[PDB]
Paper text:
In addition, we determined the structures of two co-complexes of wt-SAMHD1(109-626), also in the presence of Mg2+, with (i) GTP (AL1), dATP (AL2) and dCMPNPP (active site) and (ii) GTP (AL1), dATP (AL2) and TMPNPP (active site). dATP was added to the latter two complexes to stimulate tetramer assembly, as dCMPNPP and TMPNPP are poor AL2 activators. SEC-MALLS analysis revealed that all four dNMPNPP analogues, which have an imido substitution at the α,β-bridging oxygen, when combined with GTP, support the formation of stable SAMHD1 tetramers, albeit to varying degrees. Near-complete tetramerisation was observed with dAMPNPP, while dCMPNPP promoted the least tetramerisation and dGMPNPP was able to support tetramerisation without additional GTP, presumably by occupying both AL1 and AL2 allosteric sites. The most significant effect of dATP addition was observed with dCMPCPP, with kcat being increased 2.5-fold, presumably due to the limited ability of C-based nucleotides to induce SAMHD1 tetramerisation by AL2 binding. Further investigation using inhibition assays revealed that all dNMPNPP analogues were actually competitive inhibitors of SAMHD1-dNTP triphosphohydrolase activity, with inhibition constants (Ki) ranging from 0.78 µM for dAMPNPP to 0.052 µM for dGMPNPP, with the following rank order of increasing affinity: dAMPNPP < TMPNPP < dCMPNPP < dGMPNPP. The resolution of these structures varied between 2.0 and 3.2 Å, but all structures contain highly homologous “closed” tetramers of the SAMHD1 catalytic domain, with pairwise root-mean-square deviations (RMSDs) of <0.5 Å across all atoms in each tetramer. In the active site of the dNMPNPP structures, regardless of the nucleotide base, it is apparent that the side chain of Asp311 of the HD motif not only makes a coordinate bond with the bound active site Fe but also acts as an acceptor in a hydrogen bonding interaction with the proton (Himido) of the α,β-imido group of the dNMPNPP.
Author numbering:
A (entry chain B): 114 to 275, 284 to 599
B (entry chain C): 114 to 277, 284 to 599
C (entry chain D): 114 to 277, 283 to 599
D (entry chain A): 112 to 276, 284 to 599
């Protein structure tokens, strides 16, 4: 029956038998072989951690929050059925991540198959369905009081989202949808686990207290719908939650070398895509890019693929294997510099393909010893936000006061502090050069710093040093 | 000989015999009986920690940074004499804190003796001098290669800045970086912060966002304007904005906690009422009061958090007024918090006007029926400045950076060059209002007066304002 | 109303209003001014922590364990009344500690008033009674469903055990005997008091803690043992329980009984003894009490805390000059000097009656070495320290009950043989430290010779450093070669 | 041009890697350790324990540097050069280069079963793989560039790892013998390898670590013992050293030898054995090697990691179906069932020669009620596990040298008597776990009866759960009542 398991982040947690049964399936255990931070392990040697253990922790925390809301407010009529369903959603929320997590849905699939709109979330829904059907879970759900028709829908809806649009639960339990993946503002237990866990393994202490948020969480009526509200005074801690997030993106998740290793692995997958077969349903053969179309195949597609390519001897894989071998020897593409747009210029995702052409096109006003072609440059554009593009997510949180804990309210940015961020979204543009040698790298720097001046981008931090002859050209930089 | 000591923050640290000798003196051991966070212990029950152990840690970290700079750059010619002097400064930097730390220099002395400009730092210099002279330290300094004339000046200068072109008499310009270790006047990045971040977090029950050890690995001395200064690596600029964010965050959560501060004001209140009647024997047997002990260091040595309990346990009828306040803190009959607000636009509230603000709150005429009128002496208004340690200025604009490709060439990094998600301003005010009358009827009235006062002075709407004063918040068009 | 409070060990904990009301009283807030580890702060500069915050944490953990037992086993019929009572006991379990905690009941009172048998626990009962009566708590207890007649008895009984075979407790019946094993476990010593201090003392000391209380709670269960419902642990956890008591003994060796920590304790105690006659503390009806007699009146004892140290230190009364001088020697670090450590051999316990006589014995030893300086008995301090697993000579795991996976209601026993050959052979020993009150180089050498000879004379273990400190004496003993 | 590199380890913080070390690190032979898990199958029981050999290897390298560097500051007379330091760091960094798939499963279970004729250790592999790393990545010129002498130093590095290829070492003279006690201490076992894994395994396992390496370093010192300079610890630290080995044994009991962790190890090993014949790995000159023979060629062994598990799991070849089915049973958690644990009594060791025979013995037991289901010997797994203080039956503290405060160059010994009566009596024992390959309710009951009888038959300790699982058998033994 109930099973205790020792997580270093959360301690000894209990898993209800139904959860154990879901956990002990190929579709779930698959997450033991997919790293949380993708290529980040190749920069932060602590970050060996995989999706499996994150997935357990999200499940656990989903349980804590829903269970706590129920103790504090019986009127909500949260059943142990609701609790199990929320735990299951949490547990299975990342079932559909690919090899190297965010590299797969974020870099690889968009390049290998531009026609498809595919997300790790959609994969989770599909893989959940596959897990359920192939391991006879529906009878076991019934055994512990679930109703598979309704509840499987509710679980899927928690993961990917949908008058009242949800078919899984009624409006009087809309708060249950704000636990595992919060579409309204982003404050969800997924974040809370990864903050704590990624910090543990990364070697960074975490600024944020989930346990305290749970103690000051409460359900109130907002616009004819019951939602999770936080206490008025906690507004500060919530701005700090999203700061913590952006901070972890800057330090670790978007680390300039972590990302170049990601682009190199992605590059290697693209060159191996044609030649690697993965057996799926009915014995049909799938490629790495097409395994997402069949979940029995996708079950077998993990970080393994990296080592399968690396260890191979097939001459068809030589191109892909050479890239991965350059990662072993640490002949990585070289970082040239970082820059941002100015004013209110967003760079459209359509234009990313075109940017290397632009860097090589720049004509710096001294004659150059080495010309470099566009295919020598990589430009990587990265969006940093508070999880809702240009919007302040705290403008989409509801609060309560000590003196009236059932009355929800709003808190604007003025009402909190003048020292908060002015905008909530920006872009970072990193430029790397594929040619490693001393002469090419100098040239690349000159092209880059000029390109920055040409497009009225911010001056590179190191710009005066790396390109001392170019930085006086721009009046705006002096 | 050398002594090893086990600090929970820093681990096993070595104390050079000279340091041990300074440590084992009444003037230093005094810091065992002064709490770091003052009244904060009465809100965060972890925060029992005292200045003693902070003082050791600052000393230790001062040593780490100067010692590391020396390994990485021999050309700087940092002597073991320089290292000891920097450690000593770090160790003794907080020697002059009063009872309840920041309550003393921050609330009490300014009220008891408005004529004096007195800082905890100035006290540290005076108390250092007293420690040296009364415990025969000068011969021991000489024994380990120091030159007391020069070095005592250098130590004092590290603590309070220049005692009177190059302003320092303690060291030459080619060692100006040594002045940026214990107390950094240029930008505020000093080892004092680094210890208290880690230590206060440990005891408070808050995890700390900031890695001092990493800063030390990417620290370096370079020439800036004919003067050798500590520079950080270009890419670390992000972590430095995050250092000051961490600081402001700890002020909001803990150091300026609304009840922590009201306990501070109540203790301060009790000291003021006991000031006339408590005698402290100083030099030559002269009798000093709590407010005047700062004028004589032998007296000040005996002035610690003890004073709280001396007042509490006393039986003298002259202390009954003061003792009653402290007894109300035991029973938890604290002054009640009404709400918080801020100015709008760019209106600073001058420190001269703080005395006048309770008069203003009671003066407000809210269009609500009230049973109970409240007089100005019933209100406490507390104005709190939150900044990045340099009033309105961005301290990162006063940091120097180096690049990987040229590690001796210093540069500057502007705010644009880093991120759009950084703060717009670097200084603000918080205005808390409390009410001395505790009952249900007075507290309601106080809320109405307060929320109206906010509307009257075009301050921000209190977060809870619609709930606590529902009849007043529609009056302001700007809030709808 | 309910109150959330942030402890660095346990996180955000909730305090029921009744608890808040008990907490916000002079008798309880007094614990803010008494240090957990006494003199240990003067050796481990992290250990500033006071009884107040320990007391909260014990209260909290008492709540967790009783609350968990209730979720896992409804049949036990644990009421929210039971829970509050257990929390209150936990919260108030250390109400009666004196200045510098264990120094007071352990060194000072036994010396100042040898006629009395007084424990910190008995004090807790008295001070609880005083807290209740002086702050009108009884109506508030009733308000939240307690029955003060029964429950105040139950609370006191948790703290000190039975107030007067049959069932000895008047506070609860036999079908709830497990409630008595939460705050202070007379059966085996596995209680939530230990669990808080392990974690907390480690946090502040700078030592990581080997023991997981949370795991014990997950594998705890109530079963019938000899017509009485007790807390049982899972069979496989037996290893972790031997490791709990090892952790405890380890913390005693490293920190609580640290050779200098203890000498600072003896010096403070010494100073209190010399100031005892001349310090007045006002009690009930204005009667004046001395430090040693404040334990007889709880209104006086309320005002007796670590303050007393500083009151003595800062004083100018010529009657206190003797006491003040000792405390001033602690500031300057002119501490009594450690000579060495030793143990008895075989199965010889040293009776507590004989402790007074041991300094006389050390000076009496006639070492065959030339000495400049004879030392009198009053120059030596001998400190005898018992190290055990909390139950004198007994193995406390022999007094634990266990359950198996296959039958979780059937209790069993586990012997020492059944666990491991690498466990301790005995569960109690003595340590004998000798210090010398004369500090100079010549006296310290002499003291070493007297000591190492005394060890040989009484067939004690050879001091670790013995060949170095007394090279001329160690060949005399055939048993050491 | 090539420069120092900073890297952020969660255990040790920001550590500096000298360019020579970076160059060794950035090679296929070293990066291979990213794909080998520290605790083997332990990840399948402690979901925190994802950590691999790579990051341990860095940390050992780092700590090797700290200890040697510290000894040099405190005692210049030893004349420790930056050349010595680099060599010690390199040894530390490369000490585990030769671990196989699932770390200790490979050298401990698999190879002994697949190839009983060979004596092969993970250490020997480290030496071979170090040689291969050096030669294939042109390291010798780079060593010279930073002042090493490859002839001498490569020998010294290898000798640190496996011991010696009168004074047996050719790598350094007797006046630097202490350098051999840093990465892998043959004398007593106190080495920086332990110190890293204690801290690291604890971090990831969810257990706090009882032991302070940093403190040991502050109280470490080199002294002359028997015409040879060795690392000595301070007299008073002897307690902490007994606690180091206790910590170690404690981590073995809780985690490394966890009853299910070990059964997953035996199942993976089982699957490798069934796949051994059919999986090819390309080595030097394109020769094909099997999993068991990859140890004979280091270019092949470079490609042999935990991958092999997934290669078997994902495969479609019908020749691998047997092996793949075992691994699939680990996914679904149809593990072999644990029956119970027991130990020998008196001083009876079970010889390693007799391990093959023990399943035969369990099935042979004739319990005095007739059994409905008979079980054959191949249905039982008996796993015998030695728990010690790292030196079989010996106390490693008897092989430590100590110094006193009063004479810090004079080494001494400290016996067990001189420390504590509460220390272990013996320093080595055996654990015998029995599992059953048949999972069903009827077979498991039978297995329990066979097992508990076998315990009685061989005069082993009574299983903790024995009264419950086999209530009809436990009264038969007079010794158990
Ligand atoms: N079942 C399961 N357990 C895991 C997993 N990861 C870690 N564990 C821990 O592994 C422990 C041992 O596994 P169990 O499956 O209980 O194996 P067992 O104890 O032989 O089988 P039971 O009789 O059912 O307890 C559990 O108690 C868990 O805490 C996992 O993926 N599945
Ligand atoms: N076992 C321990 N583990 C961790 N810290 C300890 C331990 N024992 C003592 N400490 C602490 C207390 C001190 O702050 C610091 C040094 O104490 P300790 O090593 O006992 O030196 P000491 O100065 O009393 O001995 P000596 O004078 O004999 O050199 O470490
Ligand atoms: N942001 C924070 N992070 C962590 N701990 C905090 C924070 N703010 C306060 N604490 C600690 C201090 C106290 O121990 C406990 C409660 O603080 P707080 O909730 O503000 O109490 P309070 O009595 O001021 O709230 P209330 O507004 O209900 O009266 O938590
Ligand atoms: N902001 C940070 N806080 C903590 N750790 C960090 C941070 N940034 C990076 N790390 C970790 C990852 C690596 O192990 C180590 C080195 O990171 P980084 O210093 O950015 O190396 P790098 O090689 O990218 O820099 P460079 O090429 O500029 O020398 O620090
Ligand atoms: Fe997630
Ligand atoms: Fe206690
Ligand atoms: Fe190792
Ligand atoms: Mg997701
Ligand atoms: Mg007690
Ligand atoms: Mg090894």
């Amino acid at each position: 029956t109930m099973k205790v398991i020792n997580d270093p982040i959360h301690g000894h947690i209990e898993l209800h038998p139904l959860l154990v049964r879901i956990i002990d399936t190929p579709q779930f255990q698959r997450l033991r072989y997919i790293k949380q931070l993708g290529g980040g392990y190749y920069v932060f040697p602590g970050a060996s951690h995989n999706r499996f253990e994150h997935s357990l922790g999200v499940g656990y925390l989903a349980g804590c929050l829903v269970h706590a809301l129920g103790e504090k407010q019986p009127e909500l009529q949260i059943s142990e059925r609701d609790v199990l369903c929320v735990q299951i959603a949490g547990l299975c929320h990342d079932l559909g991540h690919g090899p190297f997590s965010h590299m797969f849905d974020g870099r690889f699939i968009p390049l290998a198959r531009p026609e498809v709109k595919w997300t790790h979330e959609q994969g989770s829904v599909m893989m959940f369905e596959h897990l359920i059907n192939s391991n006879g879970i529906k009878p076991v759900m019934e055994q512990y009081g679930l109703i598979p028709e309704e509840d499987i829908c509710f679980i899927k809806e928690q993961i990917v989202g949908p008058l009242w649009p949800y078919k899984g639960r009624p409006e009087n339990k809309s708060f249950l949808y704000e636990i595992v993946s919060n579409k309204r503002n982003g404050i969800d237990v997924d974040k809370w686990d990864y903050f704590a866990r990624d910090c543990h393994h990364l070697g960074i202490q975490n600024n944020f207290d989930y346990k305290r948020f749970i103690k000051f969480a409460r359900v109130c009526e907002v616009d004819n719908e019951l939602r999770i509200c936080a206490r008025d005074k906690e507004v500060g801690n919530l701005y700090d939650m999203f700061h913590t997030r952006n901070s972890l993106h800057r330090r670790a998740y978007q680390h300039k070398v972590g990302n170049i290793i990601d682009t190199m692995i992605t590059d290697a997958f693209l060159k191996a895509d044609d030649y690697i077969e993965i057996t799926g349903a009915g014995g049909k053969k799938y490629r790495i890019s097409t395994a997402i179309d069949d979940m029995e195949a996708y079950t077998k597609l993990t970080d393994n693929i990296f080592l399968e390519i690396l260890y191979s001897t097939d001459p068809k894989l030589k191109d892909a294997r050479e890239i991965l071998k350059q990662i072993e020897y640490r002949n990585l593409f070289k970082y040239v510099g970082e820059t941002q747009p100015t004013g209110q210029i967003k760079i459209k995702r359509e234009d990313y393909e075109s940017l290397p052409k632009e860097v090589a096109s720049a004509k710096p006003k001294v004659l150059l010893d080495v010309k470099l072609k566009a295919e020598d440059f990589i430009v990587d554009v990265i969006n940093m936000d508070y999880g809702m593009q240009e919007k302040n997510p705290i403008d989409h949180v509801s609060f309560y006061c000590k003196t009236a804990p059932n009355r929800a309210i709003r808190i604007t940015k003025n009402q909190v502090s003048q020292l908060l961020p002015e905008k909530f979204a920006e872009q970072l543009i990193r430029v790397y050069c594929k040619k490693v040698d001393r002469k090419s790298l100098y040239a690349a720097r000159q092209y880059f710093v000029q390109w920055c001046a040409d497009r009225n981008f911010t001056k590179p931090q190191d710009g005066d040093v790396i390109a001392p002859l170019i930085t006086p050209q721009k009046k705006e930089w002096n």
